[model samples]
Target chain A: RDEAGITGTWYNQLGSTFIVTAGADGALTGTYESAVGNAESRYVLTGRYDSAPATDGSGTALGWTVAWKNNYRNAHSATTWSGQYVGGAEARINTQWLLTCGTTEANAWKSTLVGHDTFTKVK
Target chain B: RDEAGITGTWYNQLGSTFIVTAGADGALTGTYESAVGNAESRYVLTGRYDSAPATDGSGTALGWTVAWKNNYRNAHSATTWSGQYVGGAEARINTQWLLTCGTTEANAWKSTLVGHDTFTKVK
Candidate 1:
């Protein structure tokens, strides 16, 4: 796998965009500009990946957390994407995320929503 | 959440099928049918879930582990999907999983493929 494996702009089906940089030290940093759902503002995200890279670049677990500062809705929720960087011809980042609109820890299970996105490299 | 809450058949976008039963005791049992890529065959899956269920049934974390048995071309990997269950209009079980293609304990992290799927109830 290249040291800059997933370092590039990626887009989901809904046209949401993000530019990611995979540091040599396993740091995954990026800025996301969402055009989907409630949290549509640009936000900074940070996470990490495995130190080792596969020959086909198919086996690294990727994850990052985003703090949506959507002051428009007066709601600031958090969304984390847990994904794997898949290699081969079907190269892509498959992620699953749960956006918490409310704290389930406070009392009862209420309104944290769930969604997913398969991201593809744009450059 | 209903006592029989995720007790139904679900299908991914790729047409793969499975029957899930979320018991009252948090037991998630299922039988999966192959249709996606490889590891094609029927297999038994088992795991647990959160006891609490949301009003709209949207906050439970559901998880299940799939044992593909032993196969020649198979990665001999064990995969468990960790996701949140959503109810109401679009009843879905959205999940994210890392298919550890190989063990990371023996040596440096080599190969663990990750992917995700949003499944909807069918029957």
Candidate 2:
């Protein structure tokens, strides 16, 4: 199993970063270590590799819905945020990252306010 | 017992007339005649006179919360819309009229869509 670390800023469409996470991953298997916000959150990034490897590049990867659960006050809340990459390289300008809240206690907190983000790369 | 017909438009702050009613009243006793909209509604205009009166002029008046009940599909809905008068003359440009929907079946219908209008004066 290969271990890769993905860490970046997580924010809403209004340019507000509520949370950040850094984790290690291998293919679709990864464990989130840390997330920052008012409450703690856990997320799993599941995606598939797209396109063939170009010159000096890593194949494009599209993340599916994130299955996340909270352990704090908003434990019932669960949200699945989607992510996608645009270019084919380590330094690609990723575009889409839509985070939607679930119908739970934790989801209530997320939906009540705004969006959040995570920054981490774990493999 | 005095029977008077007060017919005017019942509108929200947005100038949308929902139901209009004209009714006869003596002291504060009255009955609803007709209302217009998708669902049926009944309203009682309960108000008191302000001033005594002047030559060629009617007494100024102020209306309290209208206790209304519905007999149609949105029957569970009941709202207390308030109204007031400006001038103490007949053809006076009356001022305030605020209709608020209650939390009931009919009230839900009243709130779900736009407002409606009724034109009848039942004394």
Candidate 3:
């Protein structure tokens, strides 16, 4: 049930918001939304957390890896959110997104966008 | 600027919610979230509105057609939400969703899920 206290709603300075809910089984389910470039985007977020010690003894948990989807755009419209949840209501995630609009299958995975963002829990 | 008074937040009996924002140019942008099964789904909604009469002369403004995306699952994770906005914080939407998990490109557009839902403004 301890998911670094990442449950509840969080919003950024850009009006982007995420609502995360943690399960008692260390499972995470949530929603992410942002208004970027005049297009409002939202995704269904699914991922898990482990409390096992890190291999390198870096911390108590092994961190987490989450994936999200917004398939209304095209065939390859997904993002992998990988990062660590810091103590308190703060966390960092690196985003890897695939833009498959107007692209063929052979080159579907080639076109991608990478970025980073932070989340601060509000509720 | 008038969009049949369809700008605000809405929630259904099942806890699913939507935040719709209307533009002065008859454009709409919003986010929708719902928890179905064990997964939480979100979508970025984009579309336009025409106040002109319908082809059959139904009403003052034609209905709206909106598209949403959530590409984290696979190549085809999209849904088309089409419906009309009734007056006084109410509306109905028909949903058509494509499930493209573990499928090939040739058969990507075949598998789908269909349903309907209503929205009542909460804010």
Can you list each candidate's DockQ?
A: 0.04, 0.02, 0.02
Rank by TM-score, highest first.
1, 3, 2
Best by lDDT: 1
Note the clash tally of each candidate.
Answer: 0, 38, 17
- Alpha-carbon error at B55 in model 3, in Å? 13
State the weakest 10-residue window (summed lDDT) of model 3 chain B: B57-66
Which candidate has the top score in TM-score?
1
Q: What's the lDDT for candidate 3?
A: 0.39
lDDT of each candidate versus the true structure:
0.59, 0.35, 0.39
Tens-digit per-residue lDDT, B64-99, candidate 3: 211222443212123333333434333432221221
Candidate 2 residue-wise lDDT, B13-112, digit = tens: 2222333332343234333333333334544545443334343445345344343454545433333323333332332324433333455542221231
Task: Please tell me the interface RMSD, in Å, for model 3.
Answer: 15.0
For residues B1-123, what per-residue lDDT tens digits would candidate 1 score against the true structure? Answer: 343657888888767787878667455566777576557766556544554544542356555655444232343344556566666666777666655442333432453456677788763
Q: Which ten residues in a row have the lowest lDDT in candidate 1 chain A?
A: A69-78
lDDT of 3 by residue, A2-112 (tens): 454667776655567777775554344567676553234665554433323223312111112112223432121223333334343244322212111212224423434
Which docking category, incorrect, acceptable, medium or high, applies to candidate 3?
A: incorrect
